[PDB]
């Protein structure tokens, strides 16, 4: 056997790990399958994509086209349906009819060998007809054959009877393909909509308590759900809900020693009261959790729990499974670190004494929470546990429960971030919070919406309990508004951490990304009712951004994204499309000064000619404009963070 086939079809993409791991999509998502396709000699080729479903049924006729002249790189868009493991193949072939037409259009006018040319056409169309399944279609082609062979008609009309739009459409549907050659199949994992598309809200239930009982419970915190749903969120992310250790408990503002009342850090998991399968006694019981989950469900909210594989020194594992930790010669276990950050309140897990026991216990714990209606997990610092351990764990869980979604909370070097996604993580945290200038956002999103999108789905949190960027610190509310618009329009999954709405932006000190009086170390009650009454929350904007996402299929996908040039460094423009839905966004990244600029739209990228003028509506205001190749904008911080426009019919 030869590696290369009769008609070369090479380097099909997407591909992950040379075919050893699947490429990704979700139900209803469109992406490009491509390949390098050409033949020997000078005649034309064609190609097409055969997408097969989990039962092996091929999808519809999907012809490809050359993506740029001289490159022999061909592509077509395909769309994933039901969930499961699919496959895709590229078929390449000689296209004798295109070749013959092109020659015939020169030779019949210039009078060279006309009978021989037309008879050669007739025989092609005869072979075309044999492989057409439909009777009306077959009769149409055999009619063009008899017109091609009628030697009493002028040559130009024998020809034109084979170039009619009626024949075109039969051949575009059932073309004559010579020497059909197939690539080896490549795997596609199709997962549920929520893996790619969703709005996420993070809050600490303990903070939502009462005057008589400041430490909130699942029952008091449930009161916070109707407002979260009213802001248009789909997922609630809860930091760890388990008991919290006492030995080396941290105090307020990340101090080493807790006082008597201090609540500790939820990530310091485990005490005599329980471990990763228990509920912190001050939050309530497993039943109170079921109630919280049930009430979330009625409002269209799914719960995501934090899974953090590590232990306080008081966790039961510390004595039940000493071999899950690395011990130093004196018997002690070194606290976990993430330089320059130190975690004096926890121990890391060691994996090389009993990898089987840890895997077995990890899936037991996830299955526990899954039985209680949690189908989504944020996996904390996955990059400090082995890559292959996550590969195994995710494959075990997704083998019985393929709807479960895992989110990799890894802010680390690129290779590890990409590898985690490739080995099964449905979603990834990103470098979003550190991309704030126009060049940074353009470069980064070009990467995420390009080839990386075949294996990674990004979750754009505009802030987290660990990240209050200097942009928000110095920019105030106008900066909060800009980052919300950006995050909500550039990724189909985005989120915020409670407090973001109120523009909380006081840092621990100058040059830090920690919050002052961080919620991680203390109860943080908030006056939601006052902020709403006084207009000092951006909840309305957030609510509107999520409404726009729900009304615009273009914002529920990632890969179709184009940046349009402007003449000001502080103003950025881009568009996204999905069928007949087109959304155009223009953002002023200066939160302090008003910016005016001309936005020069790449009109072909919108499906329009250069001279055209198109009606848009700014969905943030309800105002309508008429926009074409070149448009003046004026963006004043406080008043207008951005225009978020839809293209009208």
Ligand X SMILES: OC[C@H]1O[C@H](O[C@H]2[C@H](O)[C@@H](O)[C@H](O)O[C@@H]2CO)[C@H](O)[C@@H](O)[C@@H]1O
Among 136, 330, 371, 534, binds its own copies (CB under 8 A): 330
Decide: is 119 part of the binding site for its own copies (CB under 8 A).
Answer: yes
380 binds, among ligand X, its own copies, none (CB under 5 to 8 A by kind): ligand X
375 binds, among ligand X, its own copies, none (CB under 5 to 8 A by kind): none
Candidate ranges 48-56, 260-268, 273-281, 551-559; the one touching ligand X (CB under 6 A): 260-268
**Cβ atoms of residues 472 and 479 within 8 Å:** yes
267 binds, among its own copies, ligand X, none (CB under 5 to 8 A by kind): ligand X
352 binds, among ligand X, its own copies, none (CB under 5 to 8 A by kind): its own copies
Question: Strand pairing of 73-79 and 65-66?
Answer: antiparallel
- Please report which helix (H) or strand (E) contains residue 421, including its range: helix 414-422
Decide: is 425 part of the binding site for ligand X (CB under 6 A).
Answer: no
Decide: is 360 part of the binding site for its own copies (CB under 8 A).
Answer: no
CA gap 452, 432 in Å, rounded: 15
Least spacing, CB of residue 114 vs its own copies, in Å:
12
Least spacing, CB of residue 345 vs ligand X, in Å:
4
Decide: is 187 part of the binding site for its own copies (CB under 8 A).
Answer: no
Decide: is 4 part of the binding site for its own copies (CB under 8 A).
Answer: yes
Phi/psi class of residue 373: alpha, beta or left (left: φ > 0; alpha: ψ in -120 to 50)?
left
List phi, psi (to 5°) of 587.
Answer: -120, 140
Whether the bond between 14 and the residue before it is cis, its omega within 30 degrees of 0, is yes
Candidate ranges 13-21, 137-145, 146-154, 157-165; the one touching its own copies (CB under 8 A): 13-21
End-to-end CA distance of the chain: 55
Decide: is 254 part of the binding site for ligand X (CB under 6 A).
Answer: yes
Among 396, 466, 560, 618, binds ligand X (CB under 6 A): 466
Question: Strand pairing of 571-578 and 581-588?
Answer: antiparallel
- Interface characters, 38-57, with its own copies (x: CB under 8 A): x-xxx---------------
- Interface characters, 467-506, with ligand X (x: CB under 6 A): ----------------------------------------
Least spacing, CB of residue 248 vs ligand X, in Å:
9
List the interface residues with ligand X, window 350-389 (CB under 6 A).
Answer: 380-381
Whether the bond between 76 and the residue before it is cis, its omega within 30 degrees of 0, is no
Least spacing, CB of residue 49 vs its own copies, in Å:
19
Decide: is 28 part of the binding site for its own copies (CB under 8 A).
Answer: no
CA gap 94, 123 in Å, rounded: 16
With residues binned 3-state (H G I as helix, E B as strand, rest as coil), the percentages for the chain, rounded to 5, are: 35, 25, 40
Decide: is 427 part of the binding site for ligand X (CB under 6 A).
Answer: no
Specify the long-range contacts of residues 534-542, CB closer than 8 Å, at least 24 apart. Answer: 536/502, 536/503, 537/501, 537/502, 538/477, 538/480, 538/481, 538/484, 538/500, 538/501, 538/503, 539/231, 539/501, 541/481, 541/484, 541/485, 541/620, 541/641, 542/231, 542/232, 542/484, 542/488, 542/496, 542/501
Least spacing, CB of residue 420 vs its own copies, in Å:
10
CA gap 597, 634 in Å, rounded: 7
3 binds, among its own copies, ligand X, none (CB under 5 to 8 A by kind): its own copies
17 binds, among ligand X, its own copies, none (CB under 5 to 8 A by kind): its own copies
Name residue 84's beta-bridge partners.
190
DSSP letters spanning 570-606: TEEEEEEEETTEEEEEEEE--SSS-EEEEEE--GGGG
Least spacing, CB of residue 295 vs ligand X, in Å:
26
Least spacing, CB of residue 154 vs its own copies, in Å:
20
C-beta of 280 vs 378, nearer to its own copies: 378
404: nearest Cα among 495, 319, 305: 305
Among 13, 27, 32, 36, binds its own copies (CB under 8 A): 36
C-beta of 38 vs 411, nearer to its own copies: 38
Decide: is 246 part of the binding site for ligand X (CB under 6 A).
Answer: no
Decide: is 267 part of the binding site for ligand X (CB under 6 A).
Answer: yes
456 SS3 class: coil
List the interface residues with ligand X, window 102-131 (CB under 6 A).
Answer: none
Phi/psi class of residue 349: alpha, beta or left (left: φ > 0; alpha: ψ in -120 to 50)?
beta
CA gap 328, 624 in Å, rounded: 69
Compute CA distances 12 → 242, 243, 271, 591, whole Å: 47, 50, 52, 44
Compute CA distances 272 → 78, 265, 284, 296, whole Å: 54, 17, 16, 30
Least spacing, CB of residue 135 vs its own copies, in Å:
28
User: Look-up: residue for tokens 């850090």?
Assistant: 265
List phi, psi (to 5°) of 305.
Answer: -100, 155
308 binds, among its own copies, ligand X, none (CB under 5 to 8 A by kind): ligand X
466 binds, among its own copies, ligand X, none (CB under 5 to 8 A by kind): ligand X
Decide: is 65 part of the binding site for its own copies (CB under 8 A).
Answer: no
Candidate ranges 70-78, 147-155, 201-209, 544-552; the one touching its own copies (CB under 8 A): 70-78
Least spacing, CB of residue 313 vs ligand X, in Å:
11
Among 146, 323, 337, 443, binds its own copies (CB under 8 A): 337
Least spacing, CB of residue 533 vs its own copies, in Å:
48
- Interface characters, 275-314, with ligand X (x: CB under 6 A): ---------------------------------x------
320 binds, among its own copies, ligand X, none (CB under 5 to 8 A by kind): none
Burial of 546-577, coded b for 16+ CB within 10 Å and e otherwise, reads bebbeebbbbbbbbbbbbbebebebbbbbbbb
| Burial (Cβ within 10 Å: 0-12, 13-18, ≥19) of residue 457 | buried
List the interface residues with its own copies, window 373-412 (CB under 8 A).
Answer: 383-388, 391-392, 395
Among 32, 53, 66, 120, binds its own copies (CB under 8 A): 120
Decide: is 202 part of the binding site for ligand X (CB under 6 A).
Answer: no
Rounded to the nearest 5 degrees, what angle is found at the Cα of 520, between the Cα atoms of 490 and 456?
30
CA gap 546, 199 in Å, rounded: 7
C-beta of 35 vs 645, nearer to its own copies: 35
Three-state SS string over 71-83 comes to: CCEEEEEEECCCC
- Please report which helix (H) or strand (E) contains residue 189, including its range: strand 186-191
Candidate ranges 64-72, 435-443, 554-562, 609-617; the one touching its own copies (CB under 8 A): 64-72
List phi, psi (to 5°) of 49.
Answer: -110, 130
Q: Which residues of the shown chain bind its own copies in the complex (CB under 8 A)?
A: 2-6, 8, 10, 15, 17-21, 36, 38, 40-42, 70-72, 116, 119-120, 123, 179, 328-330, 332, 337-339, 348, 352, 383-388, 391-392, 395, 413, 415-416, 419, 423
Q: Which residues of the shown chain bind ligand X in the complex (CB under 6 A)?
A: 250, 254, 265, 267-268, 308, 343, 345-346, 380-381, 409, 465-466, 520
């Amino acid at each position: 056997p030869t590696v290369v086939g009769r008609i070369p079809v090479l380097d099909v993409r997407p591909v992950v790990q040379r075919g050893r791991r699947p490429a990704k999509a979700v139900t209803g998502e469109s992406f490009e399958v491509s390949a390098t396709v050409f033949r020997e000699g000078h005649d034309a080729v064609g190609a097409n994509v055969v997408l097969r479903d989990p039962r092996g049924r091929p999808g519809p006729w999907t012809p490809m086209r050359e993506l740029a002249p001289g490159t022999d790189r061909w592509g077509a868009t395909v769309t994933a349906g039901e969930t499961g493991t699919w496959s895709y193949t590229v078929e390449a072939w000689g296209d004798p009819v295109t070749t013959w037409r092109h020659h015939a259009r020169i030779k019949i006018p210039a009078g060279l060998d006309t009978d021989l040319v037309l008879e050669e056409g007739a025989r092609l169309y005869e072979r075309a007809a044999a492989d057409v399944p439909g009777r009306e279609d077959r009769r149409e082609l055999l009619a063009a054959v008899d017109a091609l062979r009628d030697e009493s008609r002028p040559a130009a009309s024998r020809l034109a009877a084979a170039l009619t739009p009626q024949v075109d459409a039969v051949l575009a549907r059932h073309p004559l393909r010579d020497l059909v050659t197939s690539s080896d199949p490549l795997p596609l994992l199709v997962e549920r909509e929520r893996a790619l598309y969703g709005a996420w809200y993070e809050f600490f239930p303990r903070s939502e308590g009462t005057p008589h009982t400041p430490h909130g419970t699942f029952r008091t915190a449930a009161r916070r759900l109707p407002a979260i749903a009213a802001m248009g969120f789909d997922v609630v992310y809860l930091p760890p809900i388990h008991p919290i250790g006492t030995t080396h408990r941290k105090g307020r503002n990340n101090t080493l020693s807790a006082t008597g009342d201090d609540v500790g850090v939820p990530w310091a998991i485990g005490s005599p009261e329980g471990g990763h399968d228990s509920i912190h006694p001050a939050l309530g019981t497993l039943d109170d959790f079921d109630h919280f989950v049930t009430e979330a469900g009625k409002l269209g909210l799914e719960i995501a729990l934090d899974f953090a594989l590590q232990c306080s020194p008081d966790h039961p594992w510390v004595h039940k499974h000493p071999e899950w930790f690395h011990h130093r010669p004196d018997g002690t276990i070194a606290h976990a670190e993430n330089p320059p950050k130190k975690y004096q309140d926890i121990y890391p897990i060691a994996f090389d004494a009993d990898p089987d026991g840890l895997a077995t216990e990890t899936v037991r714990i996830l299955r526990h929470w899954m039985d209680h209606g949690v189908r989504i997990f944020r996996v904390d610092n996955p990059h400090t546990k082995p890559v292959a351990f996550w590969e195994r764990v995710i494959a075990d869980i997704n083998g019985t429960d393929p709807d479960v979604i895992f989110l990799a909370a890894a802010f680390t070097r690129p290779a590890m971030m990409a590898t985690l996604a490739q080995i099964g993580f449905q979603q990834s945290y990103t470098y979003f919070t550190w991309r704030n200038t126009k060049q940074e956002l353009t470069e980064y999103l070009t990467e995420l919406s390009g080839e990386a999108a075949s294996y990674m789905r990004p979750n754009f949190f505009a802030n987290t309990p660990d990240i209050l960027h200097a942009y928000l610190q110095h920019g105030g509310r106008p900066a909060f508004e800009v980052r919300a618009v950006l995050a909500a329009t550039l990724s189909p999954t985005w989120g915020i951490y409670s407090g973001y709405e109120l523009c909380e932006n006081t840092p621990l000190r100058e040059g830090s990304e920690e919050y002052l009086d961080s919620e991680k170390y203390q109860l943080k009650p908030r006056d939601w009712t006052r902020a709403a009454r006084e207009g000092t929350t951006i909840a309305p904007l957030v609510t509107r951004l999520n409404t726009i996402r729900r009304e615009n299929p273009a914002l529920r996908q990632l890969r179709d994204l184009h940046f349009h040039p402007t003449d000001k460094e502080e103003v950025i423009a881009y568009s996204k499309r999905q069928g007949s839905n087109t959304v155009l966004v223009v953002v002023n990244l200066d939160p302090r000064h008003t910016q005016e600029a001309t936005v020069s739209l790449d009109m072909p990228q919108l499906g329009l000619d250069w001279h055209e003028s198109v009606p848009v509506r700014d969905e943030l205001t309800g105002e309508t404009y008429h926009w074409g190749r070149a448009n003046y904008v004026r963006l004043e911080p406080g008043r207008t963070p951005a225009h978020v426009c839809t293209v009208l019919r």
